[PDB]
Design an enzyme around this catalytic site. Structure first.
Site, PDB file in Angstrom:
ATOM      1  N   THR A 179       0.683  -1.107   0.026  1.00 60.17           N
ATOM      2  CA  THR A 179       0.017   0.110   0.128  1.00 60.17           C
ATOM      3  C   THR A 179       0.940   1.186   0.088  1.00 60.17           C
ATOM      4  O   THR A 179       1.988   1.301   0.656  1.00 60.17           O
ATOM      5  CB  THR A 179      -0.817   0.155   1.209  1.00 60.17           C
ATOM      6  OG1 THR A 179       0.058  -0.151   2.334  1.00 60.17           O
ATOM      7  CG2 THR A 179      -2.060  -0.901   1.178  1.00 60.17           C
ATOM      8  N   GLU A 254     -32.048  -5.560  -9.089  1.00 53.89           N
ATOM      9  CA  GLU A 254     -32.313  -6.582  -7.967  1.00 53.89           C
ATOM     10  C   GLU A 254     -31.316  -6.252  -7.064  1.00 53.89           C
ATOM     11  O   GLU A 254     -31.895  -6.706  -5.485  1.00 53.89           O
ATOM     12  CB  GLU A 254     -32.628  -7.813  -8.407  1.00 53.89           C
ATOM     13  CG  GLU A 254     -33.753  -8.481  -8.091  1.00 53.89           C
ATOM     14  CD  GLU A 254     -34.125  -9.964  -8.746  1.00 53.89           C
ATOM     15  OE1 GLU A 254     -34.480  -9.943  -9.867  1.00 53.89           O
ATOM     16  OE2 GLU A 254     -34.000 -10.932  -7.965  1.00 53.89           O
TER      17      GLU A 254
HETATM   18  N1  LIG Z   1      -6.188  -7.482  -4.595  1.00 54.14           N
HETATM   19  C1  LIG Z   1      -5.502  -6.720  -5.599  1.00 54.14           C
HETATM   20  N2  LIG Z   1      -5.194  -5.343  -5.105  1.00 54.14           N
HETATM   21  C2  LIG Z   1      -4.194  -4.656  -5.807  1.00 54.14           C
HETATM   22  C3  LIG Z   1      -3.727  -5.126  -7.078  1.00 54.14           C
HETATM   23  N3  LIG Z   1      -3.224  -4.101  -7.809  1.00 54.14           N
HETATM   24  C4  LIG Z   1      -2.987  -3.358  -6.606  1.00 54.14           C
HETATM   25  N4  LIG Z   1      -3.808  -3.341  -5.427  1.00 54.14           N
HETATM   26  C5  LIG Z   1      -3.888  -2.569  -4.335  1.00 54.14           C
HETATM   27  O1  LIG Z   1      -4.304  -1.524  -4.827  1.00 54.14           O
HETATM   28  C6  LIG Z   1      -3.820  -0.249  -4.205  1.00 54.14           C
HETATM   29  C7  LIG Z   1      -2.968   0.479  -4.990  1.00 54.14           C
HETATM   30  O2  LIG Z   1      -3.813   0.985  -5.779  1.00 54.14           O
HETATM   31  P1  LIG Z   1      -3.520   0.717  -7.659  1.00 54.14           P
HETATM   32  O3  LIG Z   1      -4.596  -0.016  -8.177  1.00 54.14           O
HETATM   33  O4  LIG Z   1      -2.162  -0.153  -7.747  1.00 54.14           O
HETATM   34  O5  LIG Z   1      -3.284   2.149  -8.073  1.00 54.14           O
HETATM   35  P2  LIG Z   1      -3.820   2.694  -9.417  1.00 54.14           P
HETATM   36  O6  LIG Z   1      -5.162   2.714  -9.463  1.00 54.14           O
HETATM   37  O7  LIG Z   1      -3.268   1.976 -10.845  1.00 54.14           O
HETATM   38  O8  LIG Z   1      -3.381   4.323  -9.397  1.00 54.14           O
HETATM   39  P3  LIG Z   1      -1.769   4.825  -9.707  1.00 54.14           P
HETATM   40  O9  LIG Z   1      -0.908   3.740 -10.038  1.00 54.14           O
HETATM   41  O10 LIG Z   1      -1.637   5.631  -8.321  1.00 54.14           O
HETATM   42  O11 LIG Z   1      -2.036   5.843 -10.891  1.00 54.14           O
HETATM   43  C8  LIG Z   1      -3.101  -1.042  -2.996  1.00 54.14           C
HETATM   44  O12 LIG Z   1      -3.884  -1.058  -1.635  1.00 54.14           O
HETATM   45  C9  LIG Z   1      -2.654  -2.433  -3.705  1.00 54.14           C
HETATM   46  O13 LIG Z   1      -2.519  -3.038  -2.452  1.00 54.14           O
HETATM   47  C10 LIG Z   1      -4.412  -6.280  -7.360  1.00 54.14           C
HETATM   48  O14 LIG Z   1      -4.034  -6.829  -8.665  1.00 54.14           O
HETATM   49  N5  LIG Z   1      -5.169  -7.011  -6.736  1.00 54.14           N
HETATM   50  N1  LIG Z   2      13.830   4.853  -3.395  1.00 54.43           N
HETATM   51  C1  LIG Z   2      12.694   4.285  -2.883  1.00 54.43           C
HETATM   52  C2  LIG Z   2      12.099   3.257  -3.026  1.00 54.43           C
HETATM   53  C3  LIG Z   2      10.806   2.694  -2.608  1.00 54.43           C
HETATM   54  C4  LIG Z   2      10.371   1.367  -2.829  1.00 54.43           C
HETATM   55  F1  LIG Z   2       9.772   1.341  -3.483  1.00 54.43           F
HETATM   56  F2  LIG Z   2       9.972   0.810  -1.818  1.00 54.43           F
HETATM   57  F3  LIG Z   2      11.663   0.635  -3.035  1.00 54.43           F
HETATM   58  C5  LIG Z   2      10.128   3.761  -2.081  1.00 54.43           C
HETATM   59  C6  LIG Z   2       8.707   3.575  -1.762  1.00 54.43           C
HETATM   60  C7  LIG Z   2       8.397   3.947  -0.283  1.00 54.43           C
HETATM   61  C8  LIG Z   2       7.192   3.643   0.206  1.00 54.43           C
HETATM   62  N2  LIG Z   2       6.631   3.927   1.511  1.00 54.43           N
HETATM   63  C9  LIG Z   2       7.538   4.848   2.243  1.00 54.43           C
HETATM   64  C10 LIG Z   2       7.045   4.614   3.634  1.00 54.43           C
HETATM   65  O1  LIG Z   2       5.159   4.685   3.878  1.00 54.43           O
HETATM   66  C11 LIG Z   2       4.979   3.718   3.255  1.00 54.43           C
HETATM   67  C12 LIG Z   2       5.131   3.599   1.557  1.00 54.43           C
HETATM   68  N3  LIG Z   2       6.229   3.332  -0.801  1.00 54.43           N
HETATM   69  C13 LIG Z   2       6.435   2.946  -2.023  1.00 54.43           C
HETATM   70  N4  LIG Z   2       5.344   2.317  -2.945  1.00 54.43           N
HETATM   71  C14 LIG Z   2       4.015   2.576  -2.554  1.00 54.43           C
HETATM   72  C15 LIG Z   2       3.055   2.256  -3.470  1.00 54.43           C
HETATM   73  O2  LIG Z   2       3.607   1.181  -4.594  1.00 54.43           O
HETATM   74  C16 LIG Z   2       4.713   2.064  -5.315  1.00 54.43           C
HETATM   75  C17 LIG Z   2       5.829   2.287  -4.396  1.00 54.43           C
HETATM   76  C18 LIG Z   2       7.769   2.999  -2.523  1.00 54.43           C
HETATM   77  C19 LIG Z   2      10.666   4.997  -1.973  1.00 54.43           C
HETATM   78  N5  LIG Z   2      11.808   5.291  -2.447  1.00 54.43           N
END
Ligand SMILES: Nc1nc2c(ncn2[C@@H]2O[C@H](COP(=O)(O)OP(=O)(O)OP(=O)(O)O)[C@@H](O)[C@H]2O)c(=O)[nH]1
Ligand SMILES: Nc1cc(C(F)(F)F)c(-c2cc(N3CCOCC3)nc(N3CCOCC3)c2)cn1
Ligand SMILES: Nc1ncnc2c1ncn2[C@@H]1O[C@H](COP(=O)(O)OP(=O)(O)CP(=O)(O)O)[C@@H](O)[C@H]1O
Ligand SMILES: Nc1nc2c(ncn2[C@@H]2O[C@H](COP(=O)(O)OP(=O)(O)O)[C@@H](O)[C@H]2O)c(=O)[nH]1
Ligand SMILES: [Ca+2]
Ligand SMILES: [Ca+2]
Ligand SMILES: [Ca+2]
Ligand SMILES: [Mg+2]
Ligand SMILES: [Mg+2]
Ligand SMILES: [Mg+2]
EC number: 3.6.5.-
Lengths: 436, 54, 326, 422
Positions: A179, A254
Site C-alpha cells: 500500500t 435487483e
Molecule cells: N487485490 C489486489 N489489489 C491490488 C492489485 N493491484 C494493486 N492493488 C492494491 O491497490 C492499491 C493500489 O492501487 P492501484 O490499483 O495499484 O493504483 P492505480 O489505480 O493504478 O493508481 P496509480 O498507479 O496511483 O495511478 C493498493 O492498496 C494495492 O494493495 C491487484 O492486482 N489485486
Molecule cells: N527509493 C525508494 C524506494 C521505494 C521502494 F519502492 F519501496 F523501494 C520507495 C517507496 C516507499 C514507500 N513508502 C514509504 C513509507 O510509507 C509507506 C510507503 N512506498 C512505495 N510505494 C508505495 C505504493 O506503491 C509504489 C511504491 C515506495 C521509495 N523510495
C-alpha cells in the site's frame, strides 16, 4: 436480454478484471480466441451469457468491457497475454503517466484530459446494447487512478446514463498487500465523491484475501495472481445470476432491491466458502450445513469485522453446485439456534436463496481445489462499519498534521475537500450507528 | 419458517425463506469543478515562474 | 520483546498488572495511541474493538470481551436471563426482576405484586439511586432505565451482630474461554444489625461500628468457612461454593457463542466480579455481575499475578490460585 | 519512462562514473555499450537509464558537466568511459575555485545554456520523461553552485517534472577547503526549494565507515565512492528492475515526503568476505546507525517515512518477521501519526559479488543534526566575515549569506517541530 458493461480502472481494477474474464470464459466454454462451440447461434443471440459477451459474425465472443489505466504497463500485459485476442483494442485504454497514488492527480489533473475518451469508448459499447442495465466498476480505493479517476467517471456516468444501475467492486487497502502511505486519504476522498453515484458496492479487504490465501491455501507469500483468482471466484459468484438462467438477482436493479434498504448504506458484506488448497493431498467434501455455517465465520468474510455485534438489514445466499432447497433450510434452522443473527426490527428476518447447479469452475493449474458445492453470502450488516472506522482513524491521524496534503493541493484540490469528505464519512458512520 | 417464491429451471432454483416478520450534479457543474482545479494549478505555476524570473 | 498500552488510568487491577509486566523486563509500555502493541488494557467505555487485529504481524490481546456488557448491566442482565433458553424465566438462582423505564414490564410487575422489592440502576453509584420499599407506588415515583427486583427478606445473618452480607467472587475468562474462579473470595458485611445501612452492604456505605468484627467489613473464606462449621455444621464449599460455581458457569456459558474470540482476528480475556446473596436456607442468589471490578487489598498481589500467568503469558510466553470451572 | 541523469563537478562526475559502472554491470552492458547479459529482466526496464542506439547499443542518458576539463578527461579514460555519448560532455576551462558564486553566478552562468541544450536534446527523445537526477557535492564550486543553478533552470523549463539529487555534504574530517560550509549552506537553500528528493551523503559518515567498519587505514575518495555507487544502485532498484512495485519518481516522492521542505533522506546499506549473511543480520545492520551515510543518530530523532529495499534470494516471511521485530525494538523512533510508514521492497537480482544486500532510505528528523553542524561551521567564519572576499569579489552581497543561514536555521526548526509532534 439486458446487457452489462464492466469497467476496470487502475492496476487493481485491470488485474482483477483479467482474472474475472479468464474465469468467465472457463465458465461459459469460451476459448481465449473468443470462439464458443456450444453457442449454436453464430453472429448473435440473446442468451444469458450475452449480457456480458457480444458476438461477431466470425463467431467471436467479445467481453462487454473497457480497461482504463493512466499508465500502460498493466494493460500492456492484457494486450500481449493469453487473452489478447479476446478484447477489441478500443476497449483497452492507457495514458502516458499515472496518478502517483494521488487522488487529486487522477481526478483533476489527469482525469480531466482522458475522461471524454473513456466515455466515448463506453458509448461505443452502449450503442451495441439493445437494453443496457448499467455498469460494473472495478477499482482500488487506494490507487491514484482507482480512487481519483473512478470517482470522476462515476459522476459522468450518472450524467450520461442517468437511469442505469452502477455497481462497484472496491479493493480496500491493507498494508499486508503493498500500500501507499496516502491510501486512507484516497479511500475517503473517493468514497465521498462516489457515494451518491453508486447503487451497491462490494468491498474486498486485501487483508482478508491475504489471510485466506495464507490460512486456507497455505500460500506463505500470496502474489496478486493468488489474490486475484480468489477474488474472481467471489465476483463470479456475485455476477453468476446475470450470466446464467436464474430467478434471483437477474438484473442490476435487483441487487439494490434485495440488499440496500437505505441508499447510503449500500455496502454488503461478502463471505465465501469453501476455499480449499489444490495441493491438498487428501481432502473431504463439505456439506451444505457446513459451508452455510462457515458463512458466519469472520475468517471467511471479505472484510474483517464482527457481525455478531451489528444488525442485519438483508441477506442473500448464493450457492453453486450440488445443493437442494431442503438442505439449505435444514442448515439455516440449525444455524439460527446457534448463532448471533440479529435483524433490525423494521426488516423481515429472512434469506433470499439462489442455487446454480454448476459447481464452481477453477483455473487449471491454480491454487483452488474443485469442490462439489460452494456458497457466497451477501449480507447488509452494520458490522461492516468497523472497516470505515478503521480507515477514518488512519485518515484522522495524518490529516491532523496535514501530512502529505501539499501533494493534493498541488494538483489543484482545495484542503476543504479533505474535511468535507471526512465529515461525510462521519455522517456515514453515524448512519450505521443509528440503524444498528 | 416459511418458503416462498420458489422458482425452478434447468440451471438451478431460487426461493425465499422467512423466519420472523418485522416489528445529482450536472455536466456543467462537474466541468466547472475541473476547470477551477486547473485554474489553481495554473495560478501556482505562474507564481513559480514569477519567483524563478525574480 | 512484548509491547502493551494502558488506556484506563483508574483501574487498580491493571495498574498492578502493568506494574508487574514492566517488572519482568520483557514488557514495554507504549503511549496510549501507539497501535503497534501486543496487549491493550482498554478503557471502560467505547473501547474500539474494531481497530484490533489489523496490525500485520502483531498478535493482539485485549482485557475485555466485546459484548460482555449484556451480563454487566442491570437491565440487560435481567433481559438476558429472561430471554435466554439456557437460563430461562424459571431460573431459580436469580431474584424475580422486571425492567422499568421512567420494552417495559411495568404491567407484568404489578400482576405479581412478603411483598418487599428493591429498585436500582447501573447509573446508581456510591449507594444512592437505590430504594427499598413495600409499596410499588413509592418505588415508581422514585424511578420517574431501572430494574425492580424482589428484595430477599430472609438473608443469612452472621452472629454475633445479626447482620447482612454479600459475597464477591473474582472470575477470569481467558482467550480460550477457560473459566477461572479465584480461590479467594471476600464477604462484604454490614456493621449494623439487620432490621426488617444495614440493608446495603457496599463498602463505602459502611455507619458506626465499621470494622468492629472484621477489618474494613471484609471477611475472607478461611474465617467464613470456619464460622459455617462452628455455627451450621457445614462447609463453605458444600453449602455455597457449589452453587456459586454453577451460577458462574451458567452465565458465562450462556453468552460464550456471542462473545468468544476463538476464531477472531484479535483475542480477549476479562476479569469479572460476581456478587451473590445467601438466604437463611443456605440458598445462593446472584445479584449483579461487575465487568470492571476492583480487588480486596490483601488479594491484589496474588490475583494480579494470576492474571499475568493465566491470561497474558499464556498468549505471550516469557523466557494454581484458580479453580477451573468445567 | 525515462530518467535524465546529470553529474556536475569533480565529486559529482566521480561518483556518477562509478554509478554507471555498477548499474551497467547489473544490466549486462559492457564498456562498449553492448549487452552481453543472460536474463531478460536485465533489459525489461533498461530504457529508464539507457537509450538504444543502432547496433543494439545502449547509451546512458547521462550528462557530464564541469567547469574544468580534468575530471571529465579522467572519466573518458576510465573503465566505462567509452560508453557515454561524446556530445553529452559539457565542460569549460576556467574552473570554479571551490567557490559557489563562481559556479552559480559567473563562470557557471556562461556554461549553463549549452548544458540545457543537451538536457533539452535528451528530454525531447523521451517517450515520457519521469524526471531528472543530479549527482554533485555541496562543498566545492561547480557541483554546488553551478549544479543548483542547473536545477533552477531545469525547474523553469520543466516545472512539472520530478527533480532528485544525490548530494555529498562536506565534513572537516574529509575537507578540501575551509569555504565548504559557505558553499554547502548556499546550496541547501536551493535544494530546499527546488528538489523533490535529496539523498544526503555525508563524507564524515562515509569516512568513518571505511575506517571503523571496513578497516581501511587510509580511505581514499575511491573508497568513499564505492559505498556511494552501491547505495545509488540500491535506491534505484525499484526503478530499474521489474518488481511487483510499479513506482515512478513521482510515486516515490509522494510516499516519502509528507511536508514539501522535509525531503532530505538518510541512506544506508548492508552488508559493509564469502560468508552468507542471514536475514536477521541484514535487517539489524541496515537499521544500525553505523550503517547510515548521513552522520546522524536516528535515536536522536523520529522516522517520518522509511523504505527498506532487499536484494537477492531470501525468505520474505523471514524479512517481514525481522522488519516487524526491528520496529518493535524502535517503536519510540517512528511517528505514530503516519500509519504504516515503513515500506519493505524486494528485488530478486543481487548486486555484483553479493548473494544478498539491503538498502535503507529514511526520512528522519535526526537529519537536522547534519544541517545544524553545517550551520555552526558557517557561523564560526561568518561572524568574522572570514573568507567572504572570495564571494563578494564575484558580486555577492553579505545579505545573501544572512538569508541562506536564516533559511537553514528555519529548516532545522521545522525538523525539531515534527520530532516533538505526538
Ligand atoms: N487485490 C489486489 N489489489 C491490488 C492489485 N493491484 C494493486 N492493488 C492494491 O491497490 C492499491 C493500489 O492501487 P492501484 O490499483 O495499484 O493504483 P492505480 O489505480 O493504478 O493508481 P496509480 O498507479 O496511483 O495511478 C493498493 O492498496 C494495492 O494493495 C491487484 O492486482 N489485486
Ligand atoms: N527509493 C525508494 C524506494 C521505494 C521502494 F519502492 F519501496 F523501494 C520507495 C517507496 C516507499 C514507500 N513508502 C514509504 C513509507 O510509507 C509507506 C510507503 N512506498 C512505495 N510505494 C508505495 C505504493 O506503491 C509504489 C511504491 C515506495 C521509495 N523510495
Ligand atoms: N435483591 C436484593 N435483596 C437484598 N439485598 C440486595 C438485593 N440487591 C442488592 N442488595 C444489596 O444492595 C447492595 C448493592 O446492590 P448492587 O450490587 O445492585 O449495587 P452495586 O452495583 O453498586 C455493588 P457492586 O460494587 O458489586 O457493583 C448489595 O451489596 C446488597 O447488599
Ligand atoms: N565522496 C566524495 N567526495 C568528494 C569527491 N571529490 C570531492 N569531494 C568532496 O566534495 C567537495 C569538493 O567539491 P568538488 O566536487 O571537488 O568541487 P567542484 O568540482 O567545484 O564541484 C569536498 O567536500 C570534498 O570532500 C569524491 O570523489 N567523492
Ligand atoms: Ca449466439
Ligand atoms: Ca444515480
Ligand atoms: Ca569567461
Ligand atoms: Mg497504477
Ligand atoms: Mg455495579
Ligand atoms: Mg575538487
Amino acid at each position: 436480454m439486458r446487457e452489462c458493461i464492466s469497467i476496470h480502472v487502475g492496476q487493481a481494477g485491470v488485474q482483477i478484471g483479467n482474472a474475472c474474464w479468464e474465469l468467465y470464459c472457463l465458465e461459459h466454454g469460451i476459448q481465449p480466441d473468443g470462439q464458443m462451440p456450444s453457442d449454436k447461434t453464430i453472429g448473435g443471440g440473446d442468451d444469458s451469457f450475452n449480457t456480458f459477451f457480444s458476438e461477431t459474425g466470425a463467431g467471436k465472443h467479445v467481453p462487454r468491457a473497457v480497461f482504463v489505466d493512466l499508465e500502460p504497463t498493466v494493460i500492456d500485459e492484457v494486450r500481449t497475454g493469453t487473452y489478447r485476442q479476446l478484447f477489441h483494442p478500443e476497449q483497452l485504454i492507457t495514458g502516458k503517466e499515472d496518478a502517483a497514488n494521488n487522488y487529486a492527480r487522477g481526478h483533476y489533473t489527469i482525469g480531466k484530459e482522458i475522461i471524454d475518451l473513456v466515455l466515448d469508448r463506453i458509448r461505443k459499447l452502449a450503442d451495441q446494447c439493445t437494453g443496457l442495465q448499467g455498469f460494473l466498476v472495478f477499482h482500488s480505493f487506494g490507487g491514484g487512478t482507482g480512487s481519483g479517476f473512478t470517482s470522476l467517471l462515476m459522476e459522468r456516468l450518472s450524467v450520461d446514463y442517468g437511469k442505469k444501475s452502477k455497481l462497484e467492486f472496491s479493493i480496500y487497502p491493507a498494508p499486508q498487500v503493498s500500500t501507499a502511505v496516502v491510501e486512507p486519504y484516497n479511500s475517503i476522498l473517493t468514497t465521498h465523491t462516489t457515494l451518491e453515484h453508486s447503487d451497491c458496492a462490494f468491498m474486498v479487504d486485501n487483508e482478508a484475501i491475504y489471510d485466506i490465501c495464507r490460512r486456507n491455501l497455505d500460500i506463505e507469500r500470496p502474489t496478486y495472481t493468488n489474490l486475484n483468482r480468489l477474488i474472481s471466484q467471489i465476483v463470479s459468484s456475485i455476477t453468476a445470476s446475470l450470466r446464467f438462467d436464474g430467478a434471483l438477482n437477474v438484473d442490476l436493479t435487483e441487487f439494490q432491491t434485495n440488499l440496500v434498504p437505505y441508499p447510503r448504506i449500500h455496502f454488503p458484506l461478502a463471505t465465501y466458502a469453501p476455499v480449499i488448497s489444490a495441493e491438498k493431498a487428501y481432502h473431504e467434501q463439505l456439506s451444505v450445513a457446513e459451508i452455510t455455517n462457515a458463512c458466519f465465520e469472520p475468517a471467511n468474510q471479505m472484510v474483517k469485522c464482527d457481525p455478531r455485534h451489528g444488525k442485519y438489514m438483508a441477506c442473500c445466499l448464493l450457492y453453486r453446485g450440488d445443493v437442494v432447497p431442503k438442505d439449505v433450510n435444514a442448515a439455516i434452522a440449525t444455524i439460527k439456534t446457534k448463532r448471533s443473527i440479529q435483524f433490525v426490527d423494521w426488516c423481515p428476518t429472512g434469506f433470499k436463496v439462489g442455487i446454480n447447479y454448476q459447481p464452481p469452475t477453477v483455473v487449471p493449474g491454480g491454487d483452488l481445489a474443485k469442490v462439489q458445492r460452494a456458497v457466497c453470502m451477501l449480507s447488509n450488516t452494520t458490522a461492516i462499519a468497523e472497516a470505515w472506522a478503521r480507515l477514518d482513524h488512519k485518515f484522522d491521524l495524518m490529516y491532523a498534521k496535514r501530512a502529505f496534503v501539499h501533494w493534493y493541493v498541488g494538483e489543484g484540490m482545495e484542503e476543504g475537500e479533505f474535511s468535507e469528505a471526512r465529515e461525510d464519512m462521519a455522517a456515514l458512520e453515524k448512519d450505521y450507528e443509528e440503524v444498528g | 419458517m416459511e418458503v416462498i417464491e420458489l422458482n425452478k429451471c434447468t440451471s438451478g432454483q431460487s426461493f425465499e425463506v422467512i423466519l420472523k416478520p418485522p416489528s445529482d450534479p450536472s455536466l456543467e457543474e462537474i466541468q466547472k469543478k475541473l476547470e477551477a482545479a486547473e485554474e489553481r494549478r495554473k495560478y501556482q505555476e505562474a507564481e513559480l515562474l514569477k519567483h524563478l524570473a525574480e | 520483546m512484548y509491547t502493551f498500552v494502558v488506556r484506563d488510568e483508574n483501574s487498580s487491577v491493571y495498574a498492578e498488572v502493568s506494574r508487574l509486566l514492566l517488572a519482568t523486563g520483557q514488557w514495554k509500555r507504549l503511549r496510549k495511541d501507539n497501535p503497534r502493541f501486543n496487549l491493550m488494557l482498554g478503557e471502560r467505555n467505547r473501547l474500539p474493538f474494531g481497530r484490533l487485529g489489523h496490525e500485520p504481524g502483531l498478535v493482539q490481546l485485549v482485557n475485555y470481551y466485546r459484548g460482555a456488557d449484556k451480563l454487566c448491566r442491570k437491565a440487560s442482565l435481567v433481559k438476558l436471563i429472561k430471554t435466554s433458553p439456557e437460563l430461562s424465566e424459571s431460573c431459580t438462582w436469580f431474584p424475580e426482576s422486571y425492567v422499568i423505564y421512567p420494552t417495559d414490564e411495568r404491567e407484568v410487575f404489578l400482576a405479581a405484586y412478603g411483598n418487599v422489592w428493591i429498585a436500582k440502576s447501573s447509573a446508581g453509584a456510591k449507594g444512592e439511586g437505590i430504594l427499598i420499599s413495600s409499596e410499588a407506588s413509592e418505588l415508581l415515583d422514585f424511578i420517574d432505565v431501572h430494574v425492580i427486583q424482589k428484595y430477599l427478606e430472609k438473608p443469612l445473618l452472621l452472629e454475633p451482630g445479626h447482620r447482612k452480607f454479600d459475597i464477591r467472587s473474582w472470575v477470569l475468562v481467558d482467550h480460550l474461554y477457560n473459566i477461572y474462579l479465584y480461590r479467594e473470595g471476600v464477604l462484604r458485611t454490614s456493621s449494623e444489625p439487620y432490621n426488617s445501612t444495614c440493608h446495603l452492604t457496599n463498602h463505602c456505605i459502611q455507619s458506626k461500628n465499621y470494622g468492629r468484627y472484621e477489618e474494613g467489613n471484609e471477611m475472607f473464606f478461611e474465617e467464613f468457612n470456619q464460622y459455617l462449621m462452628d455455627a451450621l455444621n457445614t462447609t463453605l464449599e458444600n453449602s455455597i461454593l457449589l452453587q456459586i460455581k454453577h451460577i458462574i458457569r451458567s452465565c458465562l456459558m450462556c453468552i460464550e457463542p456471542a462473545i468468544s474470540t476463538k476464531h477472531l482476528h484479535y483475542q480477549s480475556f476479562q476479569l469479572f466480579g460476581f456478587d451473590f446473596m445467601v438466604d437463611e436456607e443456605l440458598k445462593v442468589w446472584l445479584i449483579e455481575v461487575n465487568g470492571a471490578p476492583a480487588c480486596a487489598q490483601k488479594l491484589y498481589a496474588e490475583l494480579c499475578q494470576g492474571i499475568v500467568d493465566v491470561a497474558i503469558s499464556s498468549v505471550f510466553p516469557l523466557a494454581s490460585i484458580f479453580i477451573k470451572l468445567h | 519512462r525515462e530518467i535524465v541523469h546529470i553529474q556536475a563537478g569533480q565529486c559529482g562526475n566521480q561518483i556518477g562514473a562509478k554509478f554507471w559502472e555498477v548499474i551497467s554491470d547489473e544490466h549486462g552492458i559492457d564498456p562498449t555499450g553492448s549487452y552481453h547479459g543472460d536474463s531478460d529482466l536485465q533489459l525489461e526496464r533498461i530504457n529508464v537509464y539507457y537509450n538504444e542506439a543502432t547496433g543494439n547499443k545502449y547509451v546512458p542518458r547521462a550528462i557530464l558537466v564541469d567547469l574544468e576539463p580534468g575530471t571529465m578527461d579522467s572519466v573518458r579514460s576510465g573503465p566505462f568511459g567509452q560508453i557515454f555519448r561524446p556530445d553529452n560532455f559539457v565542460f569549460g576551462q576556467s574552473g570554479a575555485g571551490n567557490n559557489w558564486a563562481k559556479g552559480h553566478y559567473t563562470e557557471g552562468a556562461e556554461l549553463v545554456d549549452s548544458v540545457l541544450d543537451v538536457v533539452r536534446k535528451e528530454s525531447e527523445s523521451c517517450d515520457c520523461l519521469q524526471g531528472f537526477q543530479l549527482t554533485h557535492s555541496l562543498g566545492g564550486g561547480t557541483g554546488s553552485g553551478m549544479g543548483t543553478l542547473l536545477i533552477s533552470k531545469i525547474r523553469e523549463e520543466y516545472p512539472d517534472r520530478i527533480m532528485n539529487t544525490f548530494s555529498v555534504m562536506p565534513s572537516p574530517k574529509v575537507s578540501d577547503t575551509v569555504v565548504e560550509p559557505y558553499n554547502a549552506t548556499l546550496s541547501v537553500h536551493q535544494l530546499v526549494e527546488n528538489t523533490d528528493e535529496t539523498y544526503c551523503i555525508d563524507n564524515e559518515a562515509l569516512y568513518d565507515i571505511c575506517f571503523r567498519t571496513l578497516k581501511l587505514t587510509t580511505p581514499t575518495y575511491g573508497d568513499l565512492n564505492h559505498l556511494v555507487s552501491a547505495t545509488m544502485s540500491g535506491v534505484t532498484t525499484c526503478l530499474r528492475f521489474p518488481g511487483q512495485l510499479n513506482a515512478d519518481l513521482r510515486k516515490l516522492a509522494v510516499n516519502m515526503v509528507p511536508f514539501p521542505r522535509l525531503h532530505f533522506f538518510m541512506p544506508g546499506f548492508a552488508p559493509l568476505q564469502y560468508r552468507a549473511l542471514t536475514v536477521p543480520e541484514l535487517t539489524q545492520q541496515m537499521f544500525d546507525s553505523k550503517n547510515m551515510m548521513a552522520a546522524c543518530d536516528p535515536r536522536h530523532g523520529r522516522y517520518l517515512t522509511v523504505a527498506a529495499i532487499f536484494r537477492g534470494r531470501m525468505s520474505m516471511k523471514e524479512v517481514d518477521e525481522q522488519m516487524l521485530n526491528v520496529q518493535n525494538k524502535n517503536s519510540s523512533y517512528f511517528v505514530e501519526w503516519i500509519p504504516n510508514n515503513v515500506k519493505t521492497a524486494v528485488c530478486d537480482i543481487p548486486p555484483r559479488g553479493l548473494k544478498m544486500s539491503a538498502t535503507f532510505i529514511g526520512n528522519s528528523t535526526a537529519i537536522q543534526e547534519l544541517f545544524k553542524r553545517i550551520s555552526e561551521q558557517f557561523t564560526a567564519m561568518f561572524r568574522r566575515k572570514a573568507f567572504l572576499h572570495w564571494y563578494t569579489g564575484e558580486g555577492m552581497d553579505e545579505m545573501e549569506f544572512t538569508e541562506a543561514e536564516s533559511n537553514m536555521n528555519d529548516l532545522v526548526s521545522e525538523y525539531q517541530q515534527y520530532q516533538d509532534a505526538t
